[PDB]
Every structure is written in structure tokens, then in C-alpha cells.
UniProtKB/Swiss-Prot annotation, chains A, B, C, D, E:
Outcome (variant: residue 8 to C): Causes formation of an artifactual disulfide bond with PSEN1
Residues carrying the site annotation Cleavage: 3-4, 24-25
Sequence segments annotated as region (Interaction with PSEN1): 8-26
Recorded consequence of changing residue 6 to Q: In CAA-APP; Dutch type
Site (Susceptible to oxidation): 19
Span covered, complete protein: 688 to 713 of 770
Residue numbers marked as site, Implicated in free radical propagation: 17
Protein name per its UniProtKB record: P3(42)
Domain of life: Eukaryota
Impact reported for residue 6 to K: In CAA-APP; Italian type
């Protein structure tokens, strides 16, 4: 499993909700 | 299980929400 | 396994929520 | 088996919340 | 099973909340 979450935001501001879900159950 | 995400945005602002569903149930 | 998460924000500001959920239950 | 969570915040300011949960149950 | 979590902040801090939770159970 190779997760790759790249966010390139040039001048975010306002309301920006960054949610990273990384749960594992084995 | 490759999950490549390359979001490229210039001047986001406003109302934005990022969600990365990375749940593994084994 | 691998879980990359990069957030490139050029001049964030405002309201920014970062939720990194990294739980490994084995 | 790696967990990368980097946030390149250039000139944040304002309201910026950060919540990273690093759980490793084995 | 490494964790590379970091938040680069170049200028501008204002109200910021850096909440990290490390739970290494082996």
C-alpha cells in the first residue's frame, strides 16, 4: 500500500478542511 | 494498492474540503 | 505500508483544518 | 511501512488547526 | 513503520493549533 496525497494549493485561505483518513484494522 | 493524488489548484479560498479515505479493514 | 501525505500551501491563512488520521490496529 | 505527513505551509496566519493521530497497535 | 509528520510554517502564525497524538503499542 503506497498512499500519496499531494495537495498543491497556491494561496488557500477561506475555509479549507484538510482531512486525511489513514486507518488500518488487521 | 497505489493511491497517488496530485491536486493542483491556484488560489483555492472559498469553501473547500479535502478528504482522503484511507481505511483498510483486513 | 507506505502512506505519503504532502500539503503544499502557498499563503494559507483564513480557516484551515488539518486532520491526519493515522491509526494502525493489528 | 511508512507514514509521511508533511504540510508545507508558507505564510499561514489566521486560524489554522492541525490534528495528527499516530496510532500503532500491534 | 516510520512516521514523518511535520508542518512547515514560513511566517504568519496567528491562531494555530498543532495537536499530535503518538500511540505506539507493540
Amino acid at each position: 500500500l503506497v498512499f500519496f496525497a499531494e495537495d498543491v494549493g497556491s494561496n488557500k485561505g477561506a475555509i479549507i478542511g484538510l482531512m486525511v483518513g489513514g486507518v488500518v484494522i488487521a
